[PDB]
Design a protein around this ligand. Structure first.
Ligand SMILES: *CCC(=O)N1CCN2Cc3ccc(-c4c(C)ccc5n[nH]cc45)c(Cl)c3OC[C@@H]2C1
Ligand SMILES: Nc1nc2c(ncn2[C@@H]2O[C@H](COP(=O)(O)OP(=O)(O)O)[C@@H](O)[C@H]2O)c(=O)[nH]1
Ligand SMILES: [Mg+2]
Ligand SMILES: [Mg+2]
Length: 168
């Protein structure tokens, strides 16, 4: 029957990964969601008229590598690389996330979308230009989002699914 998409949401602590996922799945904003909890969450959506089952891994836990997380990441079909526009370190970290995703997937041209979250905030330290240029270098789309307002949330996950469909 319906197609399942194994999505993974990655990025530095506090960028909005959980707030983004909960918005997509549950349609509300959760301030200060428990930072320890890593889980996968499912939702059926219609995208370009095709019914699809999104299985979304909201990454958390500790800053450590394991063989087990290598294997969970390897099973992911596409990844949202999330930073916050008010957190330059989070944007610098994107490169290291991509490097490790590529390591665990044999350097495949992996479906990835760059996400600049917290776009509602006036305290920007990452210029949109720098994000656009980074996504251009990686050959991936870049979406601006606010989990708080819901701006761009559907576009981020739908674009990733469209990237996975385009890929094979
Ligand atoms: C505030 C907590 C939070 O949301 N975090 C912090 C911990 N963690 C970082 C982290 C580190 C490594 C990896 C990773 C990746 C990207 C690929 C392969 C791999 N094998 N072992 C670990 C690996 C990941 Cl997925 C994460 O997830 C983000 C969270 C964010
Ligand atoms: N203003 C604003 N705050 C956000 C947004 N997304 C998440 N937050 C807040 O940023 C903090 C971290 O979000 P969280 O979802 O826990 O980040 P995660 O660590 O990446 O899972 C929390 O206080 C959230 O309410 C956003 O788009 N705008
Ligand atoms: Mg979280
Ligand atoms: Mg441990």
């Amino acid at each position: 029957g319906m197609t399942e998409y194994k999505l993974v949401v990655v990025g530095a602590c506090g960028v909005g990964k959980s707030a983004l996922t909960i918005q997509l799945i549950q349609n509300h904003f959760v301030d200060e969601y428990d930072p320890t909890i890593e889980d996968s969450y499912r939702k059926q959506v219609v995208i370009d008229g095709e019914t699809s089952l999104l299985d979304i891994l909201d990454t958390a836990g500790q800053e450590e590598y394991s063989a087990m997380r290598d294997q969970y990441m390897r099973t992911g079909e596409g990844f949202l690389l999330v930073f916050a526009i008010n957190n330059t370190k989070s944007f610098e970290d994107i490169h290291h996330y991509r490097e490790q995703i590529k390591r665990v997937k044999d350097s495949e041209d992996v479906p990835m979308v760059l996400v600049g979250n917290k776009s509602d905030l006036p305290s920007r330290t990452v210029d949109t230009k720098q994000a656009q240029d980074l996504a251009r270098s990686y050959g991936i789309p870049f979406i601006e989002t606010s989990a708080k307002t819901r701006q761009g949330v559907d576009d981020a996950f739908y674009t990733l699914v469209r990237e996975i469909r385009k890929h094979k």
